[PDB]
Design a protein around this ligand. Sequence first.
Ligand SMILES: CC(=O)N[C@H]1[C@@H](OP(=O)(O)OP(=O)(O)OC[C@H]2O[C@@H](n3ccc(=O)[nH]c3=O)[C@H](O)[C@@H]2O)O[C@H](CO)[C@@H](O)[C@@H]1O
Lengths: 10, 696
Amino acid sequence: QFMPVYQIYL
Amino acid sequence: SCPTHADSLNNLANIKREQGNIEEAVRLYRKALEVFPEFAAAHSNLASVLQQQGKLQEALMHYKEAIRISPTFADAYSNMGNTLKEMQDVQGALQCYTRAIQINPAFADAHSNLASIHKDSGNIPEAIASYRTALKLKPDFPDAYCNLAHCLQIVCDWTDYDERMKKLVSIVADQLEKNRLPSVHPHHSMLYPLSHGFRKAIAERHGNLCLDKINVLHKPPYEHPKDLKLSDGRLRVGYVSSDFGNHPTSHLMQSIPGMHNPDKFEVFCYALSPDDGTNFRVKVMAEANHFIDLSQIPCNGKAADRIHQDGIHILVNMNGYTKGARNELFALRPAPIQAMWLGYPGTSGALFMDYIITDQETSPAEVAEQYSEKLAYMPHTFFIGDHANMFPHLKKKAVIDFIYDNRIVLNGIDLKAFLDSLPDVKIVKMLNMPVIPMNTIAEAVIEMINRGQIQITINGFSISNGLATTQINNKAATGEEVPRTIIVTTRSQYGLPEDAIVYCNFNQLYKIDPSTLQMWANILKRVPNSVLWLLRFPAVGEPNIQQYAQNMGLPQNRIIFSPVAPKEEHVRRGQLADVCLDTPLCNGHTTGMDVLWAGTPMVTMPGETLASRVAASQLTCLGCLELIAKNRQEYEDIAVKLGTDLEYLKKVRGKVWKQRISSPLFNTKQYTMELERLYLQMWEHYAAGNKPDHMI
Ligand SMILES: CC(=O)N[C@H]1[C@@H](OP(=O)(O)OP(=O)(O)OC[C@H]2O[C@@H](n3ccc(=O)[nH]c3=O)[C@H](O)[C@@H]2O)O[C@H](CO)[C@@H](O)[C@@H]1O
């Protein structure tokens, strides 16, 4: 599904 | 037909078998079965001796007869299962092992054989359990103990590690002292603290198993060529491997056969394995002068005949004691000069190998006693990789400022065109590294990473998520093809903190030992906010490694595990780390080339065995001697300095980033020409009338 382990914010 | 007469002959054969005389035992076992045919013991013994002669079908026949005569014969079941396993009939092997356990629940050997079947299939937790059951039934069981020891090594179970190592050394000591086949495999022996002599003796014995299997062929010695007249002044070199395909061996040397000089050399490639359809097999078949599928010739006598009548001068063994090996071909000596090249990090122990191709940095003359064969040195390193050919998109990179070189990385063959399409791009000089500044384009790329999307289009260019390679191009993912898109690779994909020194080790966890985790714990403690990046290789070892990490004082977040990735993604994501901590016990050989191609420095501590000195040799050929540590203190200090002194980290990373292309490490054309020189030295020596001797 290729979601990252965490997310990068604005 | 006197059963007592046949009994006396049976015991006579047992004595002759225990004297290493397999053929006299065979004669007397058949003598017993001609006196009294309904002799179950004689059938099983003749089956065991025929099994080790390699006559599996006949051995299976006599096992069935013994079981028919006395059905309670659980030992014949388990040994018949071993014969079926050797025949690739795993289904029948399981039925034999489990039926033996059914008949005799206390019969430990059947449990141990069942553990081996699970081990071979990657069921390490279940293999561990069955080995423990066998040892619970028979506490003194060296085969069960040593195989279980390897399983615990594979999953990083270090319970009672020190006592286990001493017991392994004593078991090898006893088995060698009693002319018995050691329970430690020669490939595994470089993981336990054995003497170099113990290792060589184990290797020699596993090589004599080949002789027991070819002595039954009664083949006379071959006549070898004494000049290059029939070969048109060309030296005929034959590479024998079961790994011409999607195997790390091909990932290292697939370009080598095509780069031989056709004026002086004729290249023969003998595949011990069938065509798997991968492009690696296609490349070697196309570029080699001749390609022989010896997997279509099971008989080692006839396969050796095929090699001999091809006229090979130098036969190269690229398997050693690894899976798919057919070293019986080398025991029949079809070629005058036989040498070991890449597939095995150790000695053959036997005399059917004349040379071992290495370098002076991996096999110094001091440790030249750990090799039965003679040493053939290569100019810089015996190790080569095909990364310049398989992963040319990793030759240049770019970053996004959200100015690190390893946080949001882009690679691509068509990258420079895409960067020129963008209005503002900053050029960080060093040859240099473009920076995409934060803008609508960068926002869209980060959204694609965050949203879990596969791909996007920017100014008409194909921007691909680094985690979706296999669904964009499956052959690009496996390394069989060069990616035709632009791939984004972020730390957020693998959970790496965006503000931390990332140490990494993408090797299999079996190469980690308690001392190595202790060093890494010391390094992580001295470098604040640093992390250790490992792979679920295997995944069952992750809790075990984590457990010992807590014991050394490291909290949960200090070690980050990530799943094993396809070849291309594995190499590409090494860009995200800062420094690589190599495993001192068994160095990362292919993994070491993989991390160096990413431009990631690697701290190593060379040992004494070839397996423990490869990464140092790679670094010496690269030109980074400051990364090679002479002891545990210096290893920890080097890594800490790289992790705390960011300027020094930046300079060393640039040093590796440039010397990967400049140094001979990844120059395959150079390596081949030097391999050719060493080949010609070996032939000049032989044609002069000299038995093999060291080469430099
Ligand atoms: C101790 C040992 O057995 N060493 C051998 C090993 O090197 P080495 O020990 O480095 O490699 P392994 O046998 O562990 O195989 C690892 C392979 O898996 C790949 N990988 C790894 C992690 C990941 O996430 N994804 C991925 O694709 C690596 O790129 C590599 O091709 O194979 C080489 C190729 O025959 C031999 O020359 C070495 O002697």
